[PDB]
């Protein structure tokens, strides 16, 4: 008896969200296996992973051997001794498929208890970065499940072959993925454009993710990103001399800059040679569906305008959003984005938020629709008009006062 699903059926609508790369997936996958009492799906998913690689008529010569049997690494990690380094596990080749498996296993978990109820109905299914993959075949029939993992195996593979990290330095530390805070999307692109003016077409930084109002993410070659890092520092310091003059228009900006743990540039032209190869990799497999070409471009080259997409499905008035992504990523990214517009969001595979899911009474978490506190008009016995607010209601007077002077 799941109230939300029961709500979902008669009452308020729902939307599925899938997280992308940079989710710290392995520790979630390790826990998900340990927290799993049902191995039934993992039997077929492991076999089809073995199968689908063999018939491949696509090039895929380098990829298949560097691919690893998922069942072995898990059982090893369950003996508590074996596991490769985080640096090896975070590489797109083995990471991208593993992230989807964590998400797919996250789908099954809820589907175990309540399936008759916990079956299909979202309004829409949306995804982030490589998360758009697992979105597609979840909306398709169940035989398409590995096709995600199959395409993910292909996505991270070509992306790795085409472009991979050639250097890293403890300071910052410097990745292909960079994030700046507090600064306008226009201002960030300005400094971006200011710096990109000085560099060749081969290594420009570009805006990848716009996470919110003043929070963005710019990406490119780690070295060139480190150069953009220099200009923002100089401006920060020159504006410091401004702030200490005690002037507001003449005040320093207080942004927050710091890199990310992501190993390789995504949504950049540096992955452009990867699209083609990936496309052929799908058609040489039984993966044929017409969106394999569109997903790749969205993941590899085309940027992700995120806030606007999940908001669009949100402005459709769908009250609920779940995220089956590893750890939980994009569940909390979306929350202050929407905040008080009526949306509320439970991380999926999180025990606290799942406690809501499985009960009749603990379900209805619905974040406050600010319009709920919107002022109203009041009449009185002598017939005075009163503008109603949380202030007026208490005091019984107009919501205006002459402050102590």
């Amino acid at each position: 008896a799941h109230a939300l699903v029961d709500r979902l059926s008669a009452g308020e609508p729902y939307a599925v969200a899938f997280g992308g790369q940079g989710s710290a997936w392995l520790e979630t996958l390790e826990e998900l296996v340990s927290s799993a009492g049902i191995e039934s799906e993992l039997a077929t998913l492991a076999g089809e992973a073995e199968l689908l690689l063999e018939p491949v008529a696509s090039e895929l010569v380098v990829v298949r051997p560097i691919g690893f049997e998922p069942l072995q690494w898990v059982r090893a990690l369950a003996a508590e001794e074996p596991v490769p380094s985080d640096k090896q596990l975070t590489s797109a080749a083995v990471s991208v498929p593993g992230v989807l498996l964590t998400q797919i296993a996250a789908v099954r978990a809820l589907a175990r208890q309540g399936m008759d109820l916990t079956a299909t109905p979202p309004v829409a299914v949306a995804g982030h970065s490589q998360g758009v993959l697992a979105v597609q075949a979840l909306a398709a029939k169940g035989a398409k499940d590995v096709e995600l993992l199959a395409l993910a195996q292909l996505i991270g593979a070509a992306g790795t072959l085409v472009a991979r990290r050639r250097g890293i330095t403890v300071l910052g530390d410097r990745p292909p993925m960079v994030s700046v805070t507090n600064a306008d999307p226009e201002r960030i692109y300005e400094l971006l454009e200011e710096f990109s003016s000085d560099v060749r077409t081969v290594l420009p930084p570009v805006l990848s993710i716009r996470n919110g109002r003043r929070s963005v993410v710019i990406t490119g070659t780690p070295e060139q990103l480190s150069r953009f890092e220099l200009y923002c520092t100089q401006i920060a310091e020159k504006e410091e001399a401004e702030r200490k003059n005690k002037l507001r228009g003449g005040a320093v900006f207080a942004p927050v800059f710091d890199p990310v743990q992501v190993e390789v540039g995504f949504h950049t032209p540096r992955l452009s040679d990867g699209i083609e190869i990936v496309g052929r990799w799908a058609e040489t497999v039984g993966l044929d569906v017409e969106l394999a070409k569109e997903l790749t471009e969205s993941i590899l080259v085309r940027q992700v305008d995120w806030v606007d997409e999940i908001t669009e499905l949100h402005e459709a008035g769908a009250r609920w959003i779940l995220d089956l992504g590893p750890g939980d990523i994009l569940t909390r990214l979306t929350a202050p984005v929407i905040r008080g517009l009526g949306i509320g969001i439970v991380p999926a595979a999180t025990r606290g938020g799942q406690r809501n899911l499985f009960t009749v009474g603990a379900v209805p978490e619905v974040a406050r629709p600010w319009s709920s506190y919107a002022p109203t008009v009041v009449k009185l016995p002598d017939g005075s008009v009163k503008l109603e607010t949380k202030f007026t209601r208490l005091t019984g007077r107009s919501p205006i006062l002459l402050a102590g002077m």
Partner: protein, 338 residues
């Protein structure tokens, strides 16, 4: 691919109930020939005659795979070059092996060589003052300088010349010496004796300087390096062949280690600028290495040759010495003002 063998039994001699076919050596060769070359590369030299490598092209993804196969971060290491001099060994490998047997081996040697008994002694890359670069094509020549036998077995030093196709000049010289353990000869005789050195005209002497304390993991499986390098030897892959050869296990490629310790010397004393700095490297394999191995390397600054710093490297897994390495490195580039 299948390998066949044959036995013969004469029980008149009870202590020798089994005596097995003398065609074994020639029979073993035909098996290796099918697997190794598959008649894919073909030139037909006798051991003395030059072994030619037709044409070789270096893709940017072959740069990445090798630099990704061996990586160093925790020590502030930043690999930079178009082609690491370690990448030379991948080009010259399939040609060198062809010289391991011959009529000159038929004359003075029994031609008894277990391939499982093959032991790599030393490997070195000497530069002609040219360094490898981007897309320009390479063509390699391999020659056997000598064929020697030792108290511990048969040794075949192999000289290798790497040339840029488009330009048509010799860029580098690669040196390999292999040890088969069962043979004796009148060709070249050595008891304990072999020697090699990296030497230069103008030299300066220095004092021992500790540079870096290195921590290097060995790969989980040896197949990834086997694919890139072109070394298909079942010793490093198949457990049945490794056990048959009486080995501790699926031994890590000594060649991977060679690029492993090098990549550190490349980035550490070499600093964020390795490419024009290391003009040569030599590597000696002291002991065998199993996968999943935590190995500690230490490079020191010893002396100076031709304005290039010499750097000595020692390797230890616990108490055991593993690799002895030495490299010629140019100093961090200097700009003078008066």
């Amino acid at each position: 691919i299948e390998i066949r063998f044959t036995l013969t039994d004469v029980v008149r001699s009870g202590g020798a109930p089994i005596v097995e076919v003398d065609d074994a050596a020639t029979a073993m060769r035909a098996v290796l020939a099918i697997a190794a070359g598959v008649e894919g590369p073909e030139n037909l030299p006798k051991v003395v005659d030059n072994t030619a490598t037709v044409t070789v092209d270096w893709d940017p993804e072959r740069v990445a795979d090798h630099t990704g196969v061996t990586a160093t971060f925790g020590a502030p290491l930043a690999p930079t070059l178009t082609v690491v001099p370690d990448a030379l060994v991948g080009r010259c490998w399939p040609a060198v092996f062809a010289a391991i047997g011959s009529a000159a081996t038929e004359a003075g040697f029994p031609v008894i060589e277990g391939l499982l008994s093959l032991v790599h002694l030393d490997h070195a890359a000497r530069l002609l003052a040219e360094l490898p670069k981007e897309p320009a094509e390479f063509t390699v020549t391999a020659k056997a300088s000598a064929a020697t036998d030792t108290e511990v077995g048969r040794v075949v030093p192999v000289s290798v010349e790497v040339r840029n196709a488009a330009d048509g000049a010799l860029l580098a010289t690669l040196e390999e010496r292999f040890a088969i353990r069962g043979r004796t000869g009148a060709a070249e005789l050595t008891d304990p004796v072999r020697a090699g050195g990296a030497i230069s005209d103008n030299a300066t002497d220095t004092p021992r300087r500790r540079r870096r304390d290195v921590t290097v993991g060995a790969p989980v499986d040896m197949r990834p390096f086997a694919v890139v390098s072109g070394d298909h030897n079942p010793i490093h892959t198949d457990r049945a062949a490794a056990l048959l050869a009486g080995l501790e296990g699926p031994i890590v490629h000594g060649m991977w280690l060679s690029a492993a310790a090098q990549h550190v010397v490349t980035a550490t004393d070499g600093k964020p600028v390795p490419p024009a700095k290391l003009i040569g490297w030599t590597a000696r394999f002291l002991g065998m290495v199993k996968p999943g191995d935590q190995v500690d390397f230490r490079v020191d600054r010893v002396g100076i040759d031709v304005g290039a710093e010499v750097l000595e490297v020692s390797a230890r897994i616990g108490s055991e010495l593993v690799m002895a390495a030495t490299a010629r490195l140019a100093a961090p580039k200097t700009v003078y003002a008066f």
